[PDB]
Amino acid sequence: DFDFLKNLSLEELQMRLKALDPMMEREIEELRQRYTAKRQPILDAMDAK
Amino acid sequence: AADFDFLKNLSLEELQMRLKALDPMMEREIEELRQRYTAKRQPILDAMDAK
């Protein structure tokens, strides 16, 4: 909950909003990476039989 | 489990189960991420409606 937003422009609020979605998507992508590294040994162990 | 040397002594069926179990946990963590970003947008949206 930012407080510096009131005395801030409407164009500049829109930018801040727009910046968030890509930040989330990289965070999701990096989340998905931890899980790819979690799956990897399990998959390889299945190949080992 | 992060180590191959442990998991390779486990049965095929148990390995399929450990594998399937990661999906719901991941999807939960993602939803959680989404909910935190909902909180970041709220102050912007409010500030916009106040102008």
Distance from CA of A8 to the nearest CA of B (A): 8
CB contacts, 8 Å: A31 with chain B? 26, 29-30, 33
Resolution in A: 2.0
Least CB-CB distance to B19: which of A37, A42, A48? A42
Q: Which residues of B10-28 are buried (b: 16+ CB within 10 A; e: fewer)?
A: eeeeebeebeeeeeeebee
Experimental method: X-ray
Q: How far is CA A45 from the centre of its chain?
A: 30
Number of domains in chain B: 1
Least CB-CB distance to B33: which of A31, A45, A49? A31
Interface touch A24/B34, C-beta < 8 Å: yes
Q: How far is CA A46 from the centre of its chain?
A: 30
Domain of residue B12 covers 1-51
Cα angle vertex B41, ends B36, B43, to 5°? 115
CB contacts, 8 Å: B46 with chain A? 5
CATH number for the domain that contains residue A7: 4.10.170.10
- Please, what is the angle between helix A10-48 and helix B12-49, to 10°? 180
